[PDB]
Amino acid sequence: HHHHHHFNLPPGNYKKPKLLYCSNGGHFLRILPDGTVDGTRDRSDQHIQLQLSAESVGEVYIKSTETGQYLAMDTDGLVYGSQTPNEECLFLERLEENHYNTYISKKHAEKNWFVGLKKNGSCKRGPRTHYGQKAILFLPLPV
Incomplete structure (x- = not known):
């Protein structure tokens, strides 16, 4: 249920897509059509638009609006x-x-x-x- 982790949740919803901005180098999480995943500083990139969805409270899917690909590890x-x-x-x-x-x-x-x-x-x-x-720190920005 809690998966042995804290349960401090971020504010916000999944109504609209977002950009996942990484504090570390100022990169946006990018899901390449080839299944490649990286980060880019180019705000005009067409593969940085992600739609989050909640499976269960605190559990999400991170999908590429462009390709429809799901982020995975x-x-x-x-x-x-x-x-x-x-x-x-x-x-x-x-x-x-x-x-x-x-x-x-x-x-x-x-x-x-x-x-x-x-x-x-x-x-x-x-x-x-x-x-x-x-x-590991991210900021969800509006597209």
Whole structure:
């Protein structure tokens, strides 16, 4: 239910799409049509528009409005874009530092694997992410 994690939730809803802005390097979470996932500073990019949806309270899907691909994290902690929703597509959306949004792999929740962007714009691998990093901090902006 709580998945052994705090339950501080961020404000806001899923009514409209959003951009997931990463504090770390100022990148927007990007889901490439090829299943590639990274971050870009280009506000005009057509693959940064994401529609979040709540499966259950605090659990979301992050889907690309452009491609329809779901954000996901594999068994080895690699983030990728899935054509279909599966257990690797669910994330625990939580409030962080009383301000930001963090996304913890539900499948790998016990290991604290988050979605995160490096200063260079490249995704981090599950095991490389951790509480306290700027890489995991996101700001949902209107498109």
